[PDB]
């Protein structure tokens, strides 16, 4: 799963994901709980090619996220405690409905 | 991607994911925003095999979630507006760090 025109991009080394503080309590908790689903390294082009930080960082952010997006994974890889708790509730309701579907039609 | 011992399980038809109301504002919003990452149909065994709803629903919930978990997808398939906003912020910080890594060592 390689995004187009990745040639001449280099993958840097892992780093620690920044801890960010958004105002909202939702964003803060969401970020803690989900930050591991995001990249911990970026793609970039050689410095000998840039005139400033801004351009460097434009290509790096764009391509890093595109590339991270095309990457395959299992749905289960992504889920968290929260997802898990939430599927158990909704999948239970749905199985009760399937049950009713089966009793009525049977 | 088939979980073991799926034989004799049947996949029911899609339904509308229930809308659930948890007390917490986090859970409620999280669920709206994420409910589409969860199944909209379940696996189950023939009714002629059960003595009650509870057993039917035990197998159905367990296997449906296991099976949903092993299912492949792209990381980008999973992301939402929120994930996207969040990656743009963290991937920007990281690209700034990679930048500093490159300026110092260069
Ligand atoms: Cl590096
Ligand atoms: Cl059905």
Swiss-Prot record, chains A, B:
Disulfide bonds join 60-95. The glycosylation pattern (the amount of mono-, di- and non-glycosylated forms or glycoforms) seems to differ in normal and CJD prion. Changing residue 59 to N: In FFI and CJD. Its primary physiological function is unclear. May play a role in neuronal development and synaptic plasticity. May be required for neuronal myelin sheath maintenance. May promote myelin homeostasis through acting as an agonist for ADGRG6 receptor. May play a role in iron uptake and iron homeostasis. Soluble oligomers are toxic to cultured neuroblastoma cells and induce apoptosis (in vitro). Association with GPC1 (via its heparan sulfate chains) targets PRNP to lipid rafts. Also provides Cu(2+) or Zn(2+) for the ascorbate-mediated GPC1 deaminase degradation of its heparan sulfate side chains. Belongs to the prion family. The normal, monomeric form, PRPN(C), has a mainly alpha-helical structure. Misfolding of this form produces a disease-associated, protease-resistant form, PRPN (Sc), accompanied by a large increase of the beta-sheet content and formation of amyloid fibrils. These fibrils consist of a cross-beta spine, formed by a steric zipper of superposed beta-strands. Disease mutations may favor intermolecular contacts via short beta strands, and may thereby trigger oligomerization. This protein is produced by a bicistronic gene which also produces the alternative prion protein/AltPrP (AC F7VJQ1) from an overlapping reading frame. This is Major prion protein. It comes from Homo sapiens (Human).
């Amino acid at each position: 799963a390689v995004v187009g025109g990745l040639g001449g991009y280099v993958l840097g080394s892992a780093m620690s994901r920044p801890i960010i503080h958004f105002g909202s309590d939702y964003e803060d908790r969401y970020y803690r709980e989900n930050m591991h689903r995001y990249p911990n390294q970026v793609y970039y082009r050689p410095m000998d090619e840039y005139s400033n930080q801004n351009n460097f960082v434009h290509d790096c952010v764009n391509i890093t996220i595109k590339q991270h997006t095309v990457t395959t994974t299992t749905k289960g890889e992504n889920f968290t405690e929260t997802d898990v708790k939430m599927m158990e509730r909704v999948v239970e309701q749905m199985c009760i409905t399937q049950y009713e579907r089966e009793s009525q039609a049977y």
